[PDB]
Paper text:
The crystal structure of EF-EG2 was determined at 1.5 Å resolution as the second example of eukaryotic GH family 9 enzyme following that of NtEgl. The crystals belonged to the space group P3221 with unit-cell parameters of a = b = 136 Å, c = 55.0 Å. The final refined EF-EG2 structure includes 435 residues (Phe21–Gly455), which have 23 alternative side-chain conformations, two ions (Ca2+ and Na+), seven crystallization reagents (one citrate, one Tris and five glycerol molecules) and 694 waters. The overall structure of EF-EG2 consists of 12 α-helices which form the (α/α)6 barrel fold, an additional six short helices and two β-strands. The location of the calcium ion is conserved in GH family 9 enzyme structures; however, its role in the catalytic activities of these enzymes is still unclear. TRS is recognized by the side-chain carboxyl oxygen atom of Glu431 via direct hydrogen bond (O—O distance: 2.6 Å) and by those of the Asp74 and Asp77 via water-mediated hydrogen bonds. These glutamic and aspartic acid residues, Glu431, Asp74 and Asp77, are conserved throughout GH family 9 enzymes, and are thought to be crucial residues for its catalytic activity. In superposed structures, the location of TRS, GOL1 and GOL2 loosely corresponded to the glucose units in subsites −1, +1 and −2, respectively. The negatively charged amino acids (Asp and Glu) of EF-EG2 occupy over two-thirds of accessible surface area (ASA) from the total charged amino acids (ASAAsp,Glu: 2900 Å2; ASAArg,Lys: 1300 Å2) whereas those of NtEgl occupy about half (ASAAsp,Glu: 2400 Å2; ASAArg,Lys: 2300 Å2). CtCelT has a slightly higher activity at 303 K than NtEgl, but almost loses activity at 293 K. Thus, it seems that the highly negatively charged surface of EF-EG2 contributes to its cold adaptation under 293 K. The increase in surface negative charge has also been described for cold-adapted cellulase belonging to GH family 5 from the Antarctic bacterium Pseudoalteromonas haloplanktis which retains sufficient activity at 297 K.
Author numbering: 21 to 455
């Protein structure tokens, strides 16, 4: 079946706009959103306003925020023609300019980087508009005494990918991103550790299992950006040619750097593991499929895992790695999400989309009405439409209740849309083909 990818891209970008924290521009397209968290600051009063709220909450979780940005940037680089065909290319640049600017703010000095604003427990205890928050919002950083090679190298990857994206429109901005990428990557190498041990507030939410894959990923991005041999050396030092990724996601960069190195750097040693990942996902592999055709990796965000795999498959296809099966697989997954199994899983799009995403700001009625946990519990649709949000998804039998309190299936998050959006742009690009 066919879907309007131009509309999907427009809406996915609007989802990210609805996640913006800080001082919103005059041209803000999300009418229920206003200025919020203007007090966000470091421990010496450094400005930390901006960035994205992670999910349906108001925490700024730097690790997924950075990974979502690296992934979105990669899709812009590879599938620029799809974004352009859709009229969404400059809106996509404006989308990630938001988080790139936040990463610059968070990098307060060479070897201090702010990785979280908001205490997840006090943040999640509040249900209401971000514009109405009154609780203390602590900020935490990584440093030599409290390292985070994973967070620092992921942010370096986002900044290096950002340099590549932006050097074609705002070269001064792009080259500033590159300078910070180099510095953060050096910090990551010099001060080894797991960021969610150093910023332990993150450990119940975005716990990092290992940092070596982020070291390889940051090096691969900096090699693409600079072509300096020392970065390729670092990629080989930290990268695996013998292990196959379970997922491409905010925690596990393995197939990301393997594919990036094979395609952008021409390093075929990593190619067999890319093929293993793809074939694990394709029908007949290790990932179970629901009866209606979703490749269902796990209970949490199966749409996210499949959309991420579809993204990796479409980058692979672009570079003529298993292109036929990759395109077929990716299209099957994205089209599942768009409506092939009977409903859209994208809020505000297509047939019978979810109306109750687990999301605070869209759950609240129009100002000046009050908003509290009653709006969590109320049995009807969210008062605002969270256009473009890809929800967590159905269970393994394609069941979905569309209940706000079903926080697993009705979850929305920055990382959920990041592979998805690039995959949609890739499918839009494929439509440009002769014939
Ligand atoms: Ca990792
Ligand atoms: Na404003």
């Amino acid at each position: 079946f066919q879907y309007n990818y131009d509309e999907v891209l427009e809406k996915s970008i609007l989802f990210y706009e609805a996640e913006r924290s800080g001082d919103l521009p005059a041209n803000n397209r999300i009418p229920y959103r206003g200025d919020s968290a203007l007090g966000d600051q470091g421990n010496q009063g450094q400005d930390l306003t901006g960035g994205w709220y992670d999910a349906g909450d108001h925490v700024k979780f730097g690790f997924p925020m950075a990974f979502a940005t690296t992934t979105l940037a990669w899709g812009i680089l590879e599938f620029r023609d799809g974004y352009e065909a859709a009229g969404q290319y400059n809106l996509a640049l404006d989308s990630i300019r938001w988080t790139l600017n936040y990463f610059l703010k968070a990098h307060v000095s060479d070897n201090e980087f702010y990785g979280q604003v908001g205490d997840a427990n006090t943040d999640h205890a509040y249900w209401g508009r971000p514009e109405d928050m009154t609780m203390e919002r602590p900020a935490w950083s990584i440093s030599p005494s409290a390292p985070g090679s994973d967070l620092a190298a992921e942010t370096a990857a986002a900044l290096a990918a950002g340099y590549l994206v932006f050097r074609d429109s705002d070269a001064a901005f792009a080259n500033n991103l590159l300078a910070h990428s180099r510095t953060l990557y050096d910090f990551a190498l010099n001060n080894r550790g797991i960021y969610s041990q150093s910023i332990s507030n993150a450990a119940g939410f975005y716990a990092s299992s290992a940092y070596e894959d982020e070291l390889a990923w940051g090096a691969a991005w900096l090699y693409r950006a600079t072509e300096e041999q020392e970065y390729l050396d670092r990629a080989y030092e930290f990268g695996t040619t013998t292990n196959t990724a379970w997922a491409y996601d905010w925690n596990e960069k393995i197939v990301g750097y393997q594919l990036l190195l094979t395609t952008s750097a021409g390093q075929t040693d990593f190619l067999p593991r890319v093929e293993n990942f793809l074939r694990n996902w394709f029908p007949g592999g290790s990932v179970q499929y629901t009866p209606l055709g979703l490749a269902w990796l796990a209970q949490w965000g199966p749409n996210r895992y499949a959309a991420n795999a579809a993204f990796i498959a479409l980058v692979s296809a672009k570079y003529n790695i298993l292109a036929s099966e990759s395109e077929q697989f990716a299209r099957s997954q994205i089209h599942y999400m768009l409506g092939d199994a009977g409903r859209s899983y994208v809020v505000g799009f297509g047939n019978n989309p979810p109306q109750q995403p687990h999301h605070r700001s869209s759950s609240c009625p129009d100002q000046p009405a009050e908003c509290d946990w009653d709006e969590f519990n109320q049995p009807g649709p969210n008062y605002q439409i969270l256009y473009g949000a890809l929800v967590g998804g159905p269970d393994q039998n394609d069941q979905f209740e569309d209940l706000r309190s079903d926080y697993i299936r009705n979850e929305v998050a920055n990382d959920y849309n990041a592979g998805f959006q690039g995959a949609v742009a890739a499918l839009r690009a494929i439509q440009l083909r002769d014939g």
